[PDB]
Design a protein around this nucleic acid. Structure first.
Ligand SMILES: Nc1ncnc2c1ncn2[C@@H]1O[C@H](COP(=O)(O)OP(=O)(O)OP(=O)(O)O)[C@@H](O)[C@H]1O
Ligand SMILES: [K+]
Ligand SMILES: [K+]
Ligand SMILES: [K+]
Ligand SMILES: [K+]
Ligand SMILES: [K+]
Ligand SMILES: [K+]
Ligand SMILES: [K+]
Ligand SMILES: [K+]
Ligand SMILES: [Mg+2]
Ligand SMILES: [Mg+2]
Ligand SMILES: [Mg+2]
Ligand SMILES: [Mg+2]
Ligand SMILES: [Mg+2]
Ligand SMILES: [Mg+2]
Ligand SMILES: [Mg+2]
Ligand SMILES: [Mg+2]
Lengths: 124, 402, 50, 119
RNA sequence: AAACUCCAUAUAUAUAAUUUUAAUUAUAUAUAAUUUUAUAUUAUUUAUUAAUAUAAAGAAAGGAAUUAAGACAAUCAUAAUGAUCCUUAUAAUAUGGGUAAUAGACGUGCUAUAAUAAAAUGAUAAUAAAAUUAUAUAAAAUAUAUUUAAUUAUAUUUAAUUAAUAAUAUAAAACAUUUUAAUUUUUAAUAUAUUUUUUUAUUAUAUAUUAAUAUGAAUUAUAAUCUGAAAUUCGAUUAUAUGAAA
């Protein structure tokens, strides 16, 4: 038989997904809201100083035009700012599919559902 | 020379501040700031009055790195949760001693400028210390006064006294007749060699005359003590004493100045430090009951346990090194009953108002106006700014070309 | 509603190219700051889209 | 131009930096103490000094071991090494490194400055 | 050879009484791709086709090792076997010295020659990974350099941990503020301002100068410290002073 069980919102209406980039990992909690984001309990502008990192996090929500329709509680560890910001980007895209599985094709086409494989390679 | 009369030779931050780049901005007609009619301007972008702009420029209310050059004159959003809330406490609270806090770029300086605008309208005398670092960095002269037992800074005091004279209404200053007779050494280059001293008799001369006394650098500390004493004894005019970037004072206990033993001089051994902390602690009491003391921190300064402990946000830890905890400043702040007012972040509706003003000022890029729905822009800019940070909002709109 | 909306562009191709040519040693943030500050000064003298 | 003990200084030069730059034997720490002793504020410049203050600097500078006196101490310590016949003294005489540096390569500066009458 | 296989990546199950906590993890087992399908275009050996683009599904994008021969190189101070030579010495031990010498030449690195770049400061402490600790890793504190303190170095003392537990160890750049010679593009004295951390005006603010500064840190003097039984030839670190070439 198959090893896939339909993903569903939890008891509190939250979609939980994990993402990875380089050595960084991110576990995000997406719920229906008004666009509030928290990174490790801190404001987005505090945790991520680079605006390009902030724009990376917002991209999946911008593809489905739902930037003001969800509250995101992102927890990230490992690597640096770029790895964490893009690991959060990847995790938000994977968590948004539960709210509307019809938008997976648009998320895949935008490139946010693909795990970036590149990592530091020991010179050979 | 390589530099011509109009060449832009400074760095970017100073060029934007000093290059007069607002001249090309489009004149917009906005309502005027008036706290007595806040109901008509609440949650709307307003310009200041002509009388307020003149006073606030002489006080140093407007600072660099505030994107003021984008608009003809500096503008402010009259907020309900920040501007209206703070000004109502200032008019009602009996103590009237506040310290404005909040995250870097939240709008603490703008709130202080709106409190200065209120004071100008409400016939008050404003004494502002915009950049306390100027008297703590050791880049101006200092001298020891034996009669005051303090280190006076003549160069700084000359600038400060002129700001108090040029920023405040002469009529208010003239109303305060002097309570004591004062004698100073004459430094006026016209009659200095004829009149050894200039006398200010009581009940005849006013505090306006005292602020125009040209004295020698060694007697300028005694002129600053007279001005403060005269303003603290009179009960006619309220005195609003303000200090921006007060975090610098709390975290720099020892100035860069060194005494004759090569020992750094404690900040409270300077007249500016002693005077500032005397007004905050309550040692210098003002007769008028509408006098206030509004302090504001800045995110450009380092943080430590001094301010949090003084505000009651954390317990006192006795084993914290003095470089991260100054118990004397905590005692002074708690003696003055200074209360905290945290500037809240902007809500999405306030972001909408600011972005609607920016569209009318023609400061928005073509990628945010053409092919983008207005609701999408507001949601995106509310997300990219950290959910309300005014400075991150402006940067996302005018300083993000990616 | 989304079927007829083009997927928004991740980045501006021209600005990204200019930024990388300015950049050295992987210091993209400095390169982005220089370009943004320069384009900010162009707007403040021309009052057109930089 | 401000002249202190013969040395000439440009007006804009910071006093604490200028003193440690033109006077042999005075470094950053020593220059700061001289300025602190004379009541000069940390970032005061030469053009600001008055003639009474210029004389005060010369007085304090004349009560220290600087210029010839300081240079003589180094020349006499080097001469003592040669007089006792120590290995280090010979290196100074031969214009070779005196602190264990290899000589198969490099050693150009030692061949240029190492001498009994060291500047 | 390839397939296969392992690693990485995605997913599933199991294990952890979620205080050895990183469950956003650890490591055993299994699955997955050497991707798949429709459509249009251009070629073709034109068919059940390749190159293309378009649409759809997908996390899927990277590596590793691998045969036997043939021709040739190295003393291997990285193992042998024989022959050959020394046997009071070509074997063995100790003390000291040398391998660190210095005309020229060459290879490979390090630090520099300043403003798309260097220096300070950033304590409810921005953000890593992979390793190490019984022939140990050394916390916090105190003392001295040394100044309120911090920072840096050493001493005193030796907490915890022989370890998913405690320690080496608050990563750094980033980012923000301040400063920065050449540069009169500065600073100061007055006056001035609706640029006030700032503008403007008038005065002084040196000349020298194709040039080496507040760049650079070689060389050298003196004092102290660390390891060791021992730092002279010939080690490392710190302070004050020196400040070469470029
Ligand atoms: N009410 C407001 N209306 C318009 N602009 C505002 C308002 N509040 C803040 N801003 C803008 O936000 C930016 C930051 O404002 P401000 O300098 O007052 O912040 P701050 O918190 O005092 O900053 P810092 O922490 O650096 O001292 C400026 O561009 C300012 O113009
Ligand atoms: K010197
Ligand atoms: K040698
Ligand atoms: K060589
Ligand atoms: K856990
Ligand atoms: K040896
Ligand atoms: K440099
Ligand atoms: K670390
Ligand atoms: K030695
Ligand atoms: Mg501020
Ligand atoms: Mg050798
Ligand atoms: Mg941290
Ligand atoms: Mg310790
Ligand atoms: Mg840190
Ligand atoms: Mg740094
Ligand atoms: Mg040269
Ligand atoms: Mg240097």
């Amino acid at each position: 038989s198959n090893n896939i069980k339909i993903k569903t919102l939890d008891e509190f209406g939250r979609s939980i997904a994990v993402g990875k980039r380089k050595s960084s990992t991110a576990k995000v909690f997406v719920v229906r809201g008004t666009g509030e984001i928290l990174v490790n309990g801190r404001q987005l502008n505090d945790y991520f100083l680079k605006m390009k990192d902030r724009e990376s996090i917002m991209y999946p929500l911008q593809v489905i035009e739902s930037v003001g329709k969800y509250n995101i509680f992102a927890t990230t560890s490992g690597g640096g700012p770029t790895g964490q910001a893009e690991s959060i980007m990847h995790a938000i895209a994977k968590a948004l599919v539960v709210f509307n599985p019809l938008l997976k094709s648009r998320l895949h086409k935008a490139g946010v559902l693909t795990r970036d494989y590149r990592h530091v390679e020991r010179k050979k | 020379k390589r530099v011509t009369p109009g060449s832009l030779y400074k760095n970017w931050t100073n060029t934007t501040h000093t290059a007069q780049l607002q001249q090309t901005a489009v004149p917009l007609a906005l309502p005027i700031f008036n706290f007595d009619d806040i109901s008509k301007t609440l949650n709307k972008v307003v310009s200041y009055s002509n009388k307020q702009y003149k006073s606030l420029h002489h006080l140093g209310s407007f600072k660099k790195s505030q994107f003021n050059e984008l608009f003809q004159k500096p503008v402010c959003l009259v907020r309900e949760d920040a501007t209206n809330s703070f000004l109502k406490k200032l008019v009602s609270h009996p103590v009237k001693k506040f310290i404005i806090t909040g995250e870097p770029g939240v709008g603490k300086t703008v709130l202080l400028s709106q409190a200065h605008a209120y004071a100008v309208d409400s016939k008050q005398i404003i004494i502002n210390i915009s950049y306390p670092e100027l008297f703590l960095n050791g880049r101006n002269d200092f001298s020891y006064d034996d009669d005051l037992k303090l280190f006076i800074q003549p160069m700084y005091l000359k600038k400060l006294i002129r700001k108090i004279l040029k920023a405040n209404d002469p009529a208010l200053l003239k109303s305060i007749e002097l309570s004591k007779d004062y004698k100073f050494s004459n430094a006026n280059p016209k009659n200095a060699s004829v009149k050894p001293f200039v006398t200010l008799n009581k009940t005849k001369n006013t505090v306006l005359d005292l602020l125009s006394v040209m004295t020698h650098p060694h007697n300028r500390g005694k002129l600053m003590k007279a001005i403060i004493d005269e303003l603290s004894v009179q009960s006619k005019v309220p005195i609003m004493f303000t200090v921006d970037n007060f975090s610098k004072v709390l975290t720099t206990a020892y100035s860069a100045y060194r005494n004759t033993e090569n020992k750094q001089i404690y900040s409270l051994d300077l007249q500016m430090g002693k005077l500032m902390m005397d007004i905050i602690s309550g040692e210098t009491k003002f007769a008028n009951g509408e006098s206030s003391t509004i302090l504001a921190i800045s995110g450009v300064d380092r943080t430590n346990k001094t301010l949090p402990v003084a505000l009651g946000k954390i317990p006192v830890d006795p084993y914290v090194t003095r470089y991260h905890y100054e118990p004397k400043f905590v005692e002074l702040l708690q003696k003055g009953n200074v209360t905290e007012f945290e500037v809240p972040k902007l809500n999405k509706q306030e972001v909408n108002e600011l972005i609607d003003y920016y569209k009318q000022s023609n400061v928005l890029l073509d990628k945010d106006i053409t092919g983008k729905k207005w609701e999408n822009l507001i949601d995106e800019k509310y997300f990219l700014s950290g959910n309300g940070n005014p400075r991150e909002l402006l940067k996302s709109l005018v300083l993000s070309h990616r | 509603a989304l079927k007829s909306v083009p997927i928004p562009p991740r980045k501006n191709a021209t600005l990204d190219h200019i930024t990388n040519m300015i950049m050295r040693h992987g210091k993209k943030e400095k390169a982005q700051t220089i370009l943004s500050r320069a384009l900010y000064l162009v707007y403040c003298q021309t009052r057109q889209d930089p | 131009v401000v002249h202190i003990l013969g040395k000439g200084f440009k007006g804009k030069e910071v006093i604490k930096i200028a003193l440690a730059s033109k006077f042999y034997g005075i470094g950053k720490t020593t220059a700061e103490k001289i300025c602190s002793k004379l009541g000069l504020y940390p970032w005061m410049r030469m053009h600001q000094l008055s003639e009474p203050q210029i004389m005060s600097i010369a007085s304090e500078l004349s009560t220290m071991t600087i210029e010839g006196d300081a240079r003589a101490i180094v020349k006499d310590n080097i001469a003592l090494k040669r007089k006792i016949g120590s290995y280090s003294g010979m290196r100074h005489t031969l214009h070779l490194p005196v602190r264990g540096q290899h000589t198969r390569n490099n050693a150009k500066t030692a061949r240029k400055l190492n001498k009994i009458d060291r500047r």
